Design a protein around this ligand. Structure first.
Ligand code: CL
Ligand code: FE2
Length: 187
C-alpha cells in the first residue's frame, strides 16, 4: 500500500505488477503511480514504432495476465474512433506530445448524432482514466508538427471493443491488433 515513485519504466512495470497482484484495482493508486513516472524517451524508444497512416499499438507488458500495458504512437493528425473499453479499466499516460480526449455519452437506441460531452487536452506526463461507467471517448493527436506517444494500461486485458459512428451512435465490434510486441514488429 506504500506507493513509491517509479525511477524508470522498468521500475514502473514492477510496481504495477505489485498493484495488480490481487483481484481488484485501486484506480487512484494506479493513476498516481503512472503520473509519478517521469517519461524518459530512452527507456521506451524500443516500443515507439510509428506507422505513416495511422496510430500504432505496441505491447510492452502482459501484466502476468492481469493487464495489457502498451505504447501507442500517434503521427500528426492521427486519432482513434469513438470507443468503449469492454468493461475494463483504461489508464492513459502521455509520454510525448499532447492528445485531445473527447468524451461522449453512451448512445440510446434511436439513431442520433453523438454530441460531445466535453473535451480536454492531455499534456506530457499527465494520466487520464476512463471506464464504461464513465462513458466513451475519442483520443486524437491534433498536432500538425508533433508526434505523440502515450502509455496505456487496460485491466483486464481485452482484444476486442466497439467503435461508434458519430453520426448515428451505431456500434460495430473491432479486433485490436498489435503493431509490435516486446519491441518485435509483429506483422
Ligand atoms: Cl484508449
Ligand atoms: Fe480509449
Amino acid at each position: 500500500t506504500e506507493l513509491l515513485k517509479p525511477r524508470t519504466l522498468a521500475d514502473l512495470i514492477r510496481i504495477l505488477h505489485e498493484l495488480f497482484a490481487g483481484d481488484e484495482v485501486n484506480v487512484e493508486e494506479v493513476q498516481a503511480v503512472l503520473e509519478a513516472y517521469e517519461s524518459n524517451p530512452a527507456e521506451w524508444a524500443l516500443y515507439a514504432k510509428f506507422d505513416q497512416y495511422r496510430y500504432t499499438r505496441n505491447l510492452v507488458d502482459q501484466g502476468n495476465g492481469k493487464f495489457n500495458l502498451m505504447i501507442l504512437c500517434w503521427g500528426e493528425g492521427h486519432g482513434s474512433s469513438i470507443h468503449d473499453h469492454t468493461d475494463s479499466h483504461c489508464f492513459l499516460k502521455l509520454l510525448q506530445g499532447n492528445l485531445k480526449e473527447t468524451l461522449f455519452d453512451w448512445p440510446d437506441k434511436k439513431s442520433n448524432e453523438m454530441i460531445k460531452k466535453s473535451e480536454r487536452t492531455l499534456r506530457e506526463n499527465q494520466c487520464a482514466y476512463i471506464n464504461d461507467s464513465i462513458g466513451l471517448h475519442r483520443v486524437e493527436n491534433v498536432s500538425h508538427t508533433e508526434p505523440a506517444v502515450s502509455l496505456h494500461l487496460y485491466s483486464p486485458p481485452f482484444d476486442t471493443s466497439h467503435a461508434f459512428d458519430q453520426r448515428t451512435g451505431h456500434k460495430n465490434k473491432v479486433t485490436m491488433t498489435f503493431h509490435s510486441k516486446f519491441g518485435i514488429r509483429t506483422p
